[PDB]
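User: For a teaching handout, I'd like to show students what a predicted protein-ligand complex looks like in C-alpha cell form. I'll give you the sequence and the SMILES for magnesium ion. Please answer with just the structure.
Assistant: Understood, here is the input followed by the structure.
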Amino acid sequence: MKTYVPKQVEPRWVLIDAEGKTLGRLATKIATLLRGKHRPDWTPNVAMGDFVVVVNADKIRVTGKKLEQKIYTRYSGYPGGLKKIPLEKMLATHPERVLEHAVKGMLPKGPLGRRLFKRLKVYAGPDHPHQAQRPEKLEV
Amino acid sequence: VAYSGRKIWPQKHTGRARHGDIGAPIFVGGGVVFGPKPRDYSYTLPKKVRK
Amino acid sequence: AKHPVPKKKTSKARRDARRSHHALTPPTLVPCPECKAMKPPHTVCPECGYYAGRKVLEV
Amino acid sequence: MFAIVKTGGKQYRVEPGLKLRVEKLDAEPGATVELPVLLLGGEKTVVGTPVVEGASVVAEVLGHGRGKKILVSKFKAKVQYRRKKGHRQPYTELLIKEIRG
Amino acid sequence: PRAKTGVVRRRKHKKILKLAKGYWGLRSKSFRKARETLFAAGNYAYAHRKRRKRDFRRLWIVRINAACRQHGLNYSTFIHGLKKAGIEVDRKNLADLAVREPQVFAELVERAKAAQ
Amino acid sequence: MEAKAIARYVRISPRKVRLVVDLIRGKSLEEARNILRYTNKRGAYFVAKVLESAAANAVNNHDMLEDRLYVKAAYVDEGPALKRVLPRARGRADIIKKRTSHITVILGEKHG
Amino acid sequence: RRIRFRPPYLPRPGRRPRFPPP
RNA sequence: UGAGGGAAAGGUGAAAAGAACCCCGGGAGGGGAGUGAAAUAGAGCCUGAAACCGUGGGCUUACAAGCAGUCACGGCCCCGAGGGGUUGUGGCGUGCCUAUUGAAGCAUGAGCCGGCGACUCACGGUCGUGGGCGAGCUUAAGCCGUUGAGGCGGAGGCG
RNA sequence: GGUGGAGCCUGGGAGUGAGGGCGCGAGCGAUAACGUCCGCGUCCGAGCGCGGGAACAACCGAGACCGCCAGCUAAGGCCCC
RNA sequence: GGGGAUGACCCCAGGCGGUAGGGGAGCGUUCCCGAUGCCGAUGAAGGCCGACCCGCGAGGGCGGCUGGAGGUAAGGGAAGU
Ligand SMILES: [Mg+2]
Ligand SMILES: [Mg+2]
Ligand SMILES: [Mg+2]
Ligand SMILES: [Mg+2]
Ligand SMILES: [Mg+2]
Ligand SMILES: [Mg+2]
Ligand SMILES: [Mg+2]
Ligand SMILES: [Mg+2]
Ligand SMILES: [Mg+2]
Ligand SMILES: [Mg+2]
Ligand SMILES: [Mg+2]
Ligand SMILES: [Mg+2]
Ligand SMILES: [Mg+2]
Ligand SMILES: [Mg+2]
Ligand SMILES: [Mg+2]
Ligand SMILES: [Mg+2]
Ligand SMILES: [Mg+2]
Ligand SMILES: [Mg+2]
Ligand SMILES: [Mg+2]
Ligand SMILES: [Mg+2]
Ligand SMILES: [Mg+2]
Ligand SMILES: [Mg+2]
Ligand SMILES: [Mg+2]
Ligand SMILES: [Mg+2]
Ligand SMILES: [Mg+2]
Ligand SMILES: [Mg+2]
Ligand SMILES: [Mg+2]
Ligand SMILES: [Mg+2]
Ligand SMILES: [Mg+2]
Ligand SMILES: [Mg+2]
Ligand SMILES: [Mg+2]
Ligand SMILES: [Mg+2]
Ligand SMILES: [Mg+2]
Ligand SMILES: [Mg+2]
Ligand SMILES: [Mg+2]
Ligand SMILES: [Mg+2]
Ligand SMILES: [Mg+2]
Ligand SMILES: [Mg+2]
Ligand SMILES: [Mg+2]
Ligand SMILES: [Mg+2]
Ligand SMILES: [Mg+2]
Ligand SMILES: [Mg+2]
Ligand SMILES: [Mg+2]
Ligand SMILES: [Mg+2]
Ligand SMILES: [Mg+2]
Ligand SMILES: [Mg+2]
Ligand SMILES: [Mg+2]
Ligand SMILES: [Mg+2]
Ligand SMILES: [Mg+2]
Ligand SMILES: [Mg+2]
Ligand SMILES: [Mg+2]
Ligand SMILES: [Mg+2]
Ligand SMILES: [Mg+2]
Ligand SMILES: [Mg+2]
Ligand SMILES: [Mg+2]
Ligand SMILES: [Mg+2]
Ligand SMILES: [Mg+2]
Ligand SMILES: [Mg+2]
Ligand SMILES: [Mg+2]
Ligand SMILES: [Mg+2]
Ligand SMILES: [Mg+2]
Ligand SMILES: [Mg+2]
Ligand SMILES: [Mg+2]
Ligand SMILES: [Mg+2]
Ligand SMILES: [Mg+2]
Ligand SMILES: [Mg+2]
Ligand SMILES: [Mg+2]
Ligand SMILES: [Mg+2]
Ligand SMILES: [Mg+2]
Ligand SMILES: [Mg+2]
Ligand SMILES: [Mg+2]
Ligand SMILES: [Mg+2]
Ligand SMILES: [Mg+2]
Ligand SMILES: [Mg+2]
Ligand SMILES: [Mg+2]
Ligand SMILES: [Mg+2]
Ligand SMILES: [Mg+2]
Ligand SMILES: [Mg+2]
Ligand SMILES: [Mg+2]
Ligand SMILES: [Mg+2]
Ligand SMILES: [Mg+2]
Ligand SMILES: [Mg+2]
Ligand SMILES: [Mg+2]
Ligand SMILES: [Mg+2]
Ligand SMILES: [Mg+2]
Ligand SMILES: [Mg+2]
Ligand SMILES: [Mg+2]
Ligand SMILES: [Mg+2]
Ligand SMILES: [Mg+2]
Ligand SMILES: [Mg+2]
Ligand SMILES: [Mg+2]
Ligand SMILES: [Mg+2]
Ligand SMILES: [Mg+2]
Ligand SMILES: [Mg+2]
Ligand SMILES: [Mg+2]
Ligand SMILES: [Mg+2]
Ligand SMILES: [Mg+2]
Ligand SMILES: [Mg+2]
Ligand SMILES: [Mg+2]
Ligand SMILES: [Mg+2]
Ligand SMILES: [Mg+2]
Ligand SMILES: [Mg+2]
Ligand SMILES: [Mg+2]
Ligand SMILES: [Mg+2]
Ligand SMILES: [Mg+2]
Ligand SMILES: [Mg+2]
Ligand SMILES: [Mg+2]
Ligand SMILES: [Mg+2]
Ligand SMILES: [Mg+2]
Ligand SMILES: [Mg+2]
Ligand SMILES: [Mg+2]
Ligand SMILES: [Mg+2]
Ligand SMILES: [Mg+2]
Ligand SMILES: [Mg+2]
Ligand SMILES: [Mg+2]
Ligand SMILES: [Mg+2]
Ligand SMILES: [Mg+2]
Ligand SMILES: [Mg+2]
Ligand SMILES: [Mg+2]
Ligand SMILES: [Mg+2]
Ligand SMILES: [Mg+2]
Ligand SMILES: [Mg+2]
Ligand SMILES: [Mg+2]
Ligand SMILES: [Mg+2]
Ligand SMILES: [Mg+2]
Ligand SMILES: [Mg+2]
Ligand SMILES: [Mg+2]
Ligand SMILES: [Mg+2]
Ligand SMILES: [Mg+2]
Ligand SMILES: [Mg+2]
Ligand SMILES: [Mg+2]
Ligand SMILES: [Mg+2]
Ligand SMILES: [Mg+2]
Ligand SMILES: [Mg+2]
Ligand SMILES: [Mg+2]
Ligand SMILES: [Mg+2]
Ligand SMILES: [Mg+2]
Ligand SMILES: [Mg+2]
Ligand SMILES: [Mg+2]
Ligand SMILES: [Mg+2]
Ligand SMILES: [Mg+2]
Ligand SMILES: [Mg+2]
Ligand SMILES: [Mg+2]
Ligand SMILES: [Mg+2]
Ligand SMILES: [Mg+2]
Ligand SMILES: [Mg+2]
Ligand SMILES: [Mg+2]
Ligand SMILES: [Mg+2]
Ligand SMILES: [Mg+2]
Ligand SMILES: [Mg+2]
Ligand SMILES: [Mg+2]
Ligand SMILES: [Mg+2]
Ligand SMILES: [Mg+2]
Ligand SMILES: [Mg+2]
Ligand SMILES: [Mg+2]
Ligand SMILES: [Mg+2]
Ligand SMILES: [Mg+2]
Ligand SMILES: [Mg+2]
Ligand SMILES: [Mg+2]
Ligand SMILES: [Mg+2]
Ligand SMILES: [Mg+2]
Ligand SMILES: [Mg+2]
Ligand SMILES: [Mg+2]
Ligand SMILES: [Mg+2]
Ligand SMILES: [Mg+2]
Ligand SMILES: [Mg+2]
Ligand SMILES: [Mg+2]
Ligand SMILES: [Mg+2]
Ligand SMILES: [Mg+2]
Ligand SMILES: [Zn+2]
C-alpha cells in the first residue's frame, strides 16, 4: 500500500490580527500555516498550505530592548554597502517588512519556500483588500 | 628490434613525456615484453609411467 | 603579458549557447514595380533595369 | 469493510478483492492463508489491543516470485574498493478473499 | 599464441555506457566520465534506499501529528496513548487512517486519551 | 513524393554554409530562389546549385510540378577535411583544416 | 613593514625556449 | 652537410557485368535509367565500433545556485493493477587516479574516443601439491624407430 | 572460570619499518605552537561508510552482507528553517 | 552442529567495514586435443538494439535489425589473456 497523495486542493484563506502579538512567536505559526503542516495530508513537495493574511502589523510587539537594538541588515555588493537599519526605524517606515522578514526566514529556502512566501499577505492597519476571498479569522 | 639507440627527444623541457629509443615496448611498433621465444615443450615422463 | 589560455574545454552546450545570436536574417526584398521580379529596395532593378519608373540600365 | 493485517514484519490495509505482494510466505500457490488482524474498519470499527481475537483475514496465495533486480553498488574512493551485487527480493502474491470479522 | 584485446574492451565499455543513459554531457557520452558518474549513483542509491525509510516515516509523523492536533492532543501524547493502550498500528497506517478514515483515527485518538 | 539533390565534397566549411542552408529550409522553391540570390555569402552560390539541381530532378524525374515545390528538408554534413600546414613563428608549424561540406536539399510538393 | 631583508625565492625570468620539438 | 635516422599506406564483386542514354551543373557532385543475390558492394568501394558534426521527432527549460546524480511524488509522451522515455518540486550529496599523517581539495596525472601498453621465460634452488616406483628412484648425450609412435641408452645424479 | 577468527608447534607467502589526532603521565619549549620526544590507552590510518557536533580523518553515538513505504533506541534533540 | 550419511539438499545457530597484504572460487580473450566430427546462405564471426531469461558478479542465453563465410560443444591442455 503506497502512501496517500492529495490531488489538487483549493487553498483556504485565513486571516490573523497581528496586534500586540509577540513578533517571532506569531511568525512560527504563520509558517506552519504556510507550509501546510496543520493539514493531515501534508505533502512536502507541493504548495498545499494556506494563504495567510495578517493585519495590524504596525502593532506587532516585542520584548527586551529589541526596538532600539535589533538591527535589520542589507548588503549592496558595493564597497562600504552594509546597511544597518534598526527595528524602531523599520516599523517607522515599512512596518509590514518586520513580520514579513520574520516569516521569510522561518520558511524553507528553495523555490517552493519562495512560493510559500508569496502566499503571505501582510498589511499595516486594520484593513486588507482580499474581501473577495472571504478570509477565515484565526486566533492564534 | 630494428630501430636506432637515439633518444628521440631530450629528457627535460619539451612538454612531451620522456622517452628513450622507439623500440621501447611502450611505443607502437616498439618491441614486445615477455612475448614467446623459441622453446622446447618436452620433458621426460618416467619410463614406468609410460609402461 | 602572460599568454591567457582557456582553463576548461568549452562544452557542446556552451558553444552552441554562444552561437544563439549567429542566425542570418534573410535579405530584405521587394517586388520591382515594372517587371514584378523581387529585388532589394532602393536598388536599380537588375532584372529590368528600371528605377523610379524609368530605364536606368541596359541589362 | 477493510482490515489492517500484519505479515512479513509489515502491516497492510486490505479489502476483499485486493492483490498484494508481501514478504514470501511458506504455502503452496493456490493454498489459502489467514492473516492476523489489527483493526477492522468501515461499517463497524474494531481496534485490536493489539490483535483482534475474533478476526482473521483470508488470503489465497496467487504465487511467489522475485522482484526486479536492484544493483547494490559499493565504491570507496582512493582505495580501489569497488563491489557489485545484483539483488531480487523474494515475495508472495496474495489475493484477498474475505474479511472474517 | 597471441590474445590481443579483441572485442572485449568495447563490449565492456558499452555495458557501462548503456548504464549511463540520460546523464548530462560526457557523463552519458564518455566511457571514463560515465563510469565515474556511476560510482556516485551506486553509492547514492544504496544510501538513499536506506534513507527512503527515514524519509517516509517523517512524512507519516508530520501527518499523524497534524491529525492529532485537531483532536486536541499533540503527537507524542497520541503515541504514548497508543503505547499504553496496546495499539500496535504503525505510522504507515495511522497516517493512512488519518486521511482515508477520520472516524477510525478519531476513535484511535479516543483510546489514546483514555490510556492515561 | 520527394526529390533530392546532393553536392558532395563541396570545399567550403560546413559551419559556414549551414548558415545559408538554414535561411531557406522549409520555403517555397520560389522564395528560396529569391533568398539565395540576394544572400551575401559564398555559400549562397552553392546551396543555389543544389536547390536547383534538386528541382530539376523533381520536375524531370519524379513527376512533381515546379509551382508546387518547397524545401522539405535540407542540411549540411561535413566531409573529409583537407589538412594543410600553416608555418608559424619560431620554427613551429600548425595545421589548417580547409574543411569540407556535403550539402543536401530535399524538395517536396505543397498540396493544394 | 618587514626589516629582515626578504631575499627572493625565485630567479627573475628568464632564459631560452625549447624550440622546437620537430 | 655527413656518418646517419626513417615512416605511412592491404580488402568492390562470383564475375567489371566498373553504370550506355537522359536530366540539373563550367565542372565536382547528384537525380533517373541500366548491372548485380546485394550498390549505405559505386570505385572517396567488405565489415563499418567510438569520439566528433548534423537533420527530424518526444519530454523539458528564461526568479534559477550546480561533482550534475540518487530516492520520492506529480505532469506529459510512448508501448500494451505493468513498463519505458522525460523532468517540476522535494530530500540527500565534497569527481577519478595517484600520492600522503591527512585531498573536493587551490597537491600529481588525464581534451575526448579507438587501438598498443607492464610480474615472463630458462637453468638451478626451496616449500607445497598430483601421481609413478620405493632401499631405492632416475637417466644425459646419443642410438633405433616414427615422420605429430615411441623405444633403447645406467655414463651419471640423488638416496 | 573462560571453546575464542582463542592459544601453542612446524613450515609457505607477505606487507610495515614517513604515522597522525585526542585523554592521561613526564621531559623538551615559554605551565607557546594544528610545536617537539617518550610512556599508557584510544581512534583515524584502512571505518573521507552511517547519527550527532552549523559545516569538519581521528570530540559524542555506533563497527555498514543484501532487501522492506515495519518497530525500539544512542549521542543529540522536541518554537520555525 | 543436527538430519540426508562424505555436497543429495533441508533444518538450527553464529560470522561476514576494510588500505598494504595472505588465501579461495570463478568469468572472459587467443591458440591445441576433442574434430574426416558438429553448427552454418532456411545466414559464421563481427556490429546495433532489448524494458526478456539465467547468474551475487565477471558473464552467459534468447529475440529483432545488420553482416555475408565462417564458427566451433561437453571434458581437458597451453598463453603475447
Ligand atoms: Mg495552529
Ligand atoms: Mg509603508
Ligand atoms: Mg536543508
Ligand atoms: Mg637495432
Ligand atoms: Mg639496425
Ligand atoms: Mg634501420
Ligand atoms: Mg644503442
Ligand atoms: Mg647511445
Ligand atoms: Mg638507451
Ligand atoms: Mg644512436
Ligand atoms: Mg622530463
Ligand atoms: Mg604541457
Ligand atoms: Mg603534452
Ligand atoms: Mg607523450
Ligand atoms: Mg626523452
Ligand atoms: Mg624509450
Ligand atoms: Mg629502441
Ligand atoms: Mg610492446
Ligand atoms: Mg611498423
Ligand atoms: Mg614489431
Ligand atoms: Mg614490426
Ligand atoms: Mg622485458
Ligand atoms: Mg624476453
Ligand atoms: Mg630450443
Ligand atoms: Mg615449464
Ligand atoms: Mg627433455
Ligand atoms: Mg593578457
Ligand atoms: Mg610585450
Ligand atoms: Mg607564452
Ligand atoms: Mg595569448
Ligand atoms: Mg588556464
Ligand atoms: Mg564540443
Ligand atoms: Mg547541439
Ligand atoms: Mg558560452
Ligand atoms: Mg515595389
Ligand atoms: Mg511479524
Ligand atoms: Mg520476502
Ligand atoms: Mg516485498
Ligand atoms: Mg578520488
Ligand atoms: Mg569522496
Ligand atoms: Mg582507488
Ligand atoms: Mg587514504
Ligand atoms: Mg576505489
Ligand atoms: Mg557498475
Ligand atoms: Mg585487440
Ligand atoms: Mg591488450
Ligand atoms: Mg575491444
Ligand atoms: Mg575497460
Ligand atoms: Mg560485440
Ligand atoms: Mg563486456
Ligand atoms: Mg535527465
Ligand atoms: Mg551528453
Ligand atoms: Mg552536452
Ligand atoms: Mg559522443
Ligand atoms: Mg544513507
Ligand atoms: Mg539500503
Ligand atoms: Mg495542543
Ligand atoms: Mg515507547
Ligand atoms: Mg509503538
Ligand atoms: Mg545577407
Ligand atoms: Mg527546370
Ligand atoms: Mg625548422
Ligand atoms: Mg625558420
Ligand atoms: Mg587541434
Ligand atoms: Mg587543425
Ligand atoms: Mg637519429
Ligand atoms: Mg611508426
Ligand atoms: Mg573478390
Ligand atoms: Mg578481386
Ligand atoms: Mg558470391
Ligand atoms: Mg551527363
Ligand atoms: Mg552542362
Ligand atoms: Mg570556362
Ligand atoms: Mg557524372
Ligand atoms: Mg542530381
Ligand atoms: Mg548517377
Ligand atoms: Mg534488376
Ligand atoms: Mg537468398
Ligand atoms: Mg549495410
Ligand atoms: Mg555490403
Ligand atoms: Mg563500405
Ligand atoms: Mg567479402
Ligand atoms: Mg561510411
Ligand atoms: Mg533537435
Ligand atoms: Mg525573487
Ligand atoms: Mg520559472
Ligand atoms: Mg514525500
Ligand atoms: Mg517519475
Ligand atoms: Mg511511468
Ligand atoms: Mg533533485
Ligand atoms: Mg522528505
Ligand atoms: Mg562539491
Ligand atoms: Mg570531506
Ligand atoms: Mg576511477
Ligand atoms: Mg596520477
Ligand atoms: Mg607526491
Ligand atoms: Mg607530500
Ligand atoms: Mg606532507
Ligand atoms: Mg573541487
Ligand atoms: Mg586537481
Ligand atoms: Mg580550495
Ligand atoms: Mg579544482
Ligand atoms: Mg603544484
Ligand atoms: Mg609532487
Ligand atoms: Mg593534447
Ligand atoms: Mg569527447
Ligand atoms: Mg583506450
Ligand atoms: Mg603488470
Ligand atoms: Mg612471477
Ligand atoms: Mg618449483
Ligand atoms: Mg615436485
Ligand atoms: Mg616411477
Ligand atoms: Mg606407494
Ligand atoms: Mg646434482
Ligand atoms: Mg579451533
Ligand atoms: Mg582474528
Ligand atoms: Mg590473530
Ligand atoms: Mg608465518
Ligand atoms: Mg604468495
Ligand atoms: Mg608476495
Ligand atoms: Mg614498508
Ligand atoms: Mg627506516
Ligand atoms: Mg613522520
Ligand atoms: Mg620511523
Ligand atoms: Mg610516534
Ligand atoms: Mg616521530
Ligand atoms: Mg597515539
Ligand atoms: Mg578529563
Ligand atoms: Mg619524563
Ligand atoms: Mg602531556
Ligand atoms: Mg604566558
Ligand atoms: Mg583539526
Ligand atoms: Mg604533532
Ligand atoms: Mg598539544
Ligand atoms: Mg606537549
Ligand atoms: Mg612532525
Ligand atoms: Mg598510508
Ligand atoms: Mg570512528
Ligand atoms: Mg568517521
Ligand atoms: Mg579501526
Ligand atoms: Mg578513503
Ligand atoms: Mg555524510
Ligand atoms: Mg560526522
Ligand atoms: Mg546535520
Ligand atoms: Mg553532522
Ligand atoms: Mg558487521
Ligand atoms: Mg519511540
Ligand atoms: Mg539522552
Ligand atoms: Mg530558512
Ligand atoms: Mg547467516
Ligand atoms: Mg569483507
Ligand atoms: Mg580459504
Ligand atoms: Mg576478456
Ligand atoms: Mg578461463
Ligand atoms: Mg595456432
Ligand atoms: Mg581438426
Ligand atoms: Mg572443421
Ligand atoms: Mg546443416
Ligand atoms: Mg543466399
Ligand atoms: Mg537474414
Ligand atoms: Mg568467437
Ligand atoms: Mg576468431
Ligand atoms: Mg549476429
Ligand atoms: Mg549480453
Ligand atoms: Mg572457407
Ligand atoms: Mg575449442
Ligand atoms: Mg571447451
Ligand atoms: Mg586432454
Ligand atoms: Mg601483454
Ligand atoms: Zn524590374
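For the handout, you might add this sentence: The longest helix of chain F spans residues 42-62.
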